[PDB]
Amino acid sequence: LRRHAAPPSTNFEILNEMLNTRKNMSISLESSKALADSLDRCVDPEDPYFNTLVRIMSTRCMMAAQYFYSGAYSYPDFRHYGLAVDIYTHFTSPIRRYCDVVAHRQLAGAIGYEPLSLTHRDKNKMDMICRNINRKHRNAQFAGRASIEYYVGQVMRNNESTETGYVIKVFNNGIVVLVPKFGVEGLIRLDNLTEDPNSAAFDEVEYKLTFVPTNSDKPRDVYVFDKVEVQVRSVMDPITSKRKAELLLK
């Protein structure tokens, strides 16, 4: 089977903190439907992409779904939060998922087509299969996302363009902006963020970072969830040899 644990309150307390402070909103977390409804109404009229940004950000604070065998947990633990179903598994893709192969053999024995192999009726062997495909699943998505990272990083290799960015993380050492066009997150250090780093201030209560831009002299307050203009640029670090995307806001 395959279950999905309900997200802890601690994961959304930080998101609701930024929402209630800046946008004056909140996510219920009372139920999956409550979480969905509150996430749905979380939309800014001046910018349609704001709702998408919150969704792609509230996805990062969800518990990882995992494969398992029905003897390892009780029935209420079979619950899949993200789908709101009492029970679930993978079956539709046996060519690209070994989990579906197991499910196929079990269904064949379920209908009486052919007796189920002993290896799929051993609680010990099933535990090894589940712990393996869980690890291979994580390694698959990470390798997949890394493949996107390299090719996109090669597109912006020798190119600079003013794209649309969104502030997702605010710190005293700088900010982190997300470019939806390339799907790449970038870090703008305080030294390259503004002039006179000793004059800049960070308010944790409001998630606001006030500073004076390098090409200006007017105190600008940069809050969170703000749509800002950002110049993209790629440079391979001479120490890590990883193609990172250096971003300069405007």
Binding site: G71, S74, G109, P115, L116, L118, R121, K123
Partner: protein, 300 residues
């Protein structure tokens, strides 16, 4: 002990009837008796009936501490003490007799050893507190087939039984009564079913040892009269997964290997029908208890 006297006439008649494809109850050589399963009010209370054979099983459990060797496993025992109620042939408490120890060992190897019950799921807190499931078989009336009747009685009971729900606060065990929250069923890895074959030599020993053509007769699920006149016994246990749980032909009349294999395949068709039968009677019992629960709440 107290013996059952069998005349030469009765011995010759029942054996000759077998030579003419006749058995007294009118069954067939490969025909298993109709198994009737009745559940009591409480969970774990099951009554199995095969013709005149009557057995009753009761599943119970209590909080106990696991063995030092197995801190993650719960306790599980099966009791099958005979009594003069099933007949004066049985001595009260005779748990060392040949047939008694065999029967006790067949059930144990079919349920306990086979791991039909998930003993790992009987653990509440590792190496401290666990459930101790007990299966008590009561032999009410004997007309043969006590092994097959017991194996069905134990399994039907275990699948029907439900233990009180438990929430754990460290080592503090909160045992919820049936009044507060509903009880929790047991974990069954597989459903073992026993089928016993009885062998008869229509000729003499010489033709069994050195005889060219085999002629030994084998019948399924013998009655008491057929059981007292057999020359060999075979108990084979299988499940719907097409696997042999255990086979026990402890001596007796030497039998052809291919014939014993035929019995195993014949038994598989029986255990399939029996297993599905048990499951259906469990569903209807669940539907009955739920329908009454709805009629009790509506009237409340």
């Amino acid at each position: 002990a107290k013996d059952i006297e069998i005349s030469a006439s009765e011995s010759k008649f029942i054996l000759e009837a077998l030579r003419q494809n006749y058995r007294l109850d009118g069954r067939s050589f490969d025909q298993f008796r109709d198994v009737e399963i009745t559940f009591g009010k409480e969970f774990g209370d099951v009554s199995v009936k095969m013709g005149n054979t009557k057995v009753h099983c009761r599943i119970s459990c209590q909080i106990a501490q696991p063995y030092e060797d197995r801190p993650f496993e719960g306790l599980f025992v099966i009791s099958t003490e005979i009594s003069p109620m099933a007949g004066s042939q049985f001595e009260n408490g005779n748990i060392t007799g040949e047939d008694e120890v065999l029967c006790s060992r067949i059930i144990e190897k079919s349920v306990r050893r086979s791991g039909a019950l998930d003993v790992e799921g009987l653990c509440i807190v590792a190496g401290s507190k666990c459930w101790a499931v007990r299966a008590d078989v009561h032999f009410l009336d004997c007309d043969g087939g006590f092994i097959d009747a017991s194996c069905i009685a134990v399994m039907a009971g275990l699948m029907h039984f439900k233990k009180p729900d438990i929430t754990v606060h460290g080592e503090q065990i909160i045992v919820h009564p049936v009044n507060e929250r509903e009880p929790v069923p047991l974990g069954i890895l597989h459903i073992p079913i026993c089928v016993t074959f009885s062998f008869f030599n229509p000729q003499d020993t010489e033709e069994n040892i050195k005889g060219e053509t085999n002629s030994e007769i084998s019948i399924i699920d013998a009655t008491l009269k057929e059981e007292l006149l057999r020359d060999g016994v075979l108990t084979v246990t299988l499940n719907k997964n097409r696997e042999v749980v255990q086979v026990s032909k402890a001596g007796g009349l030497p039998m052809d290997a291919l014939t014993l294999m035929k019995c195993c395949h014949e038994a598989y068709s029986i255990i399939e029908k029996i297993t599905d039968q048990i499951l259906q009677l469990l569903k209807e019992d669940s539907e009955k208890r739920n329908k009454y629960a709805a009629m009790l709440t509506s009237e409340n």
